[PDB]
Design a protein around this ligand. Structure first.
Ligand SMILES: *[C@@H]1O[C@H](CO)[C@@H](O[C@H]2O[C@H](CO)[C@@H](O)[C@H](O)[C@H]2NC(C)=O)[C@H](O)[C@H]1NC(C)=O
Ligand SMILES: *[C@@H]1O[C@H](CO)[C@@H](O)[C@H](O)[C@H]1NC(C)=O
Ligand SMILES: *[C@@H]1O[C@H](CO)[C@@H](O)[C@H](O)[C@H]1NC(C)=O
Length: 225
């Protein structure tokens, strides 16, 4: 995150940290005691989904034993994700077991199917991503205040944003992290236009996948084999 402030512990308790061999690859949000919503695109590979999921974190550098919760991924689900054009970049992770709902870990609610957010609306995005193109991750979470742009510079499958001050927005490590507006997860950080903090951050429209998500939540099994 570029152009933002440092958060306080438990300021965003829904927040997840997806890791690989202990290193932070992407963000996410806890949407159900057993699922984490994130970007499908975090899911390229080079050691594919052999990842972990850390809840309750703050300082990426410490163990924070009495606040964190660690989990492995039993399954992963997506709806028509397409990498060439980045369409439908959304994926749900099923945790090996129920997350204990504490003061440092909570659920982020979801908008109803087909809902919308008008241009000009104020939202926030937060994460442990870097502050500059190809730069170190942030050890603590940071957040910035965003504003939803007019539909003509976005895309239908997305919900775009900008900052009144040059430089603000997502950056490396911020992928999968949620855009919250009006206390609901209206977005899933996908990709960004050019130099971090420059102009039009693209987020996946969560309101389009609502019934599908409900679908997965309701019949929790690993899928066919
Ligand atoms: C949400 O909106 C869509 C479009 O207004 C409604 O139906 C559409 O969905 C059908 C099933 O996918 C499609 O066959 C149409 O192509 C499709 N159009 C778009 C572009 O998606 C849908 O009924 C609405 N649902 C509710 C719950 O409001
Ligand atoms: C709460 O969940 C944790 C982490 O998943 C688990 O190890 C623990 O047993 C649960 N706590 C209580 C006191 O049972
Ligand atoms: C968020 O917005 C509020 C209200 O405009 C403001 O007081 C605060 O500085 C903003 N924070 C960031 C981190 O941009």
């Amino acid at each position: 995150i570029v152009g933002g402030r440092k958060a306080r512990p438990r300021q965003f308790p829904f927040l997840a940290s997806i890791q690989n061999q202990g290193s932070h690859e992407c963000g996410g949000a806890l949407i159900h005691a057993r699922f984490v919503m994130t970007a499908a695109s975090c899911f390229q590979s080079q050691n594919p989904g052999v990842s972990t999921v850390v809840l309750g974190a703050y300082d990426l550098r410490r163990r924070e034993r009495q606040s964190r919760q660690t989990f492995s991924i039993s399954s992963m689900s997506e709806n028509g994700y397409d990498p060439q054009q980045n369409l439908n970049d959304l994926m749900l992770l099923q945790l090996d077991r129920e997350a204990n709902l504490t003061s440092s870990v909570t659920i982020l609610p979801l908008p109803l199917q087909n809902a919308t957010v008008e241009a000009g609306t104020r939202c926030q995005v937060a994460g442990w991503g870097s502050q500059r193109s190809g730069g170190r991750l942030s050890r603590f979470p940071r957040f910035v205040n965003v504003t939803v742009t007019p539909e003509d510079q976005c895309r239908p499958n997305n919900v775009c944003t900008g900052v009144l001050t040059r430089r603000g927005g997502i950056c490396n490590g911020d992928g999968g992290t949620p855009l919250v507006c009006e206390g609901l997860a209206h977005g899933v950080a996908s990709f960004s236009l050019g130099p971090c903090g420059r102009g039009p951050d693209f987020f996946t429209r969560v309101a389009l996948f609502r019934d599908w998500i409900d679908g997965v939540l309701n019949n929790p099994g690993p899928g066919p084999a």
